[PDB]
């Protein structure tokens, strides 16, 4: 639930 354009995710 982090946008597709965001460079970083988190898991």
């Amino acid at each position: 639930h982090i946008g597709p354009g965001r460079a970083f995710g988190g898991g």
Epitope: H1, I2, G3, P4, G5, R6, A7, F8, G10
Partner: antibody
């Protein structure tokens, strides 16, 4: 509680470097998903500046890419922003912010910018 | 980039009325069943404060008087009923992609 505090100069001569500091009290920068920097020019126009992931990595707004740099300090628990070759168009109010997991839906998170500092007014002039 | 065109810039609503701020986007902003739009309200001399996020999920501490909706390229925020401690500037904002961007905002002035 949990609070961020922008600290830094009020007046920077053009062609120098802007080095602002955001002191995070009551939360380890490590516990953060990501810490951002945003500035707001006269007229209230807002501009996202860049951020630093909990993995120490970064991402910057292209329009500034060439001259911006965001770093952090685990021990003092504050992250910094440095901006090179400052011109008069760099006069605005700067704010550091936090992005965190927000409970969206059922047992699901969603990251957003929820806590912001007071903002510090930076004047670029001779 | 993704541009956020908010409407309108100026909005005047007398007490106990209904405030309706739109906010269109250049590209759609949904993904994996979530819509990456958010809203902040800024009062003069204050940092922007997060109201709703993900289009409709209202942030705790915020009166259920505020409402968020829309999907794709169109979104919206409504106040029912408009209070005095509601005069501010509202900004929609997308977390769909980096670089993140903001709208121009909407000065909400209360009629008297």
């Amino acid at each position: 509680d949990v609070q961020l505090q922008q600290s830094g100069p009020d007046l920077v001569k053009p062609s120098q470097s802007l080095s602002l500091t955001c002191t995070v009290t009551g939360y380890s920068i490590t516990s953060g998903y990501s810490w951002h920097w945003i500035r707001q020019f006269p007229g209230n126009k807002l501009e996202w500046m860049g951020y630093i992931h909990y993995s120490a990595g970064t991402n910057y707004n292209p329009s500034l890419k060439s001259r911006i740099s965001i770093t952090r300090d685990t021990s003092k628990n504050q992250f910094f922003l440095q901006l090179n070759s400052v011109t008069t168009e760099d006069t605005a109010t700067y704010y550091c912010a936090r992005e965190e997991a927000m409970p969206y839906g059922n047992q699901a998170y969603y990251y957003a910018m929820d806590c912001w500092g007071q903002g510090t007014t930076v004047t670029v002039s001779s | 980039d993704i541009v956020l065109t908010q409407s309108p810039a100026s909005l005047a609503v007398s007490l106990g009325q209904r405030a309706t701020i739109s906010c269109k986007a250049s590209q759609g902003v949904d993904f994996d069943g979530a819509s990456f739009m958010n809203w902040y309200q800024q009062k003069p001399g204050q940092p922007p404060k997060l109201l709703i996020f993900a289009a409709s999920t209202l942030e705790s501490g915020i009166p259920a008087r505020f409402s968020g909706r829309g999907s794709g390229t169109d979104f919206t925020l409504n106040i029912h009923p408009v209070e005095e401690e509601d005069a501010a500037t509202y900004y929609c904002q997308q977390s769909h992609e980096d670089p993140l961007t903001f709208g121009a905002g909407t000065k909400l002035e209360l009629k008297r």
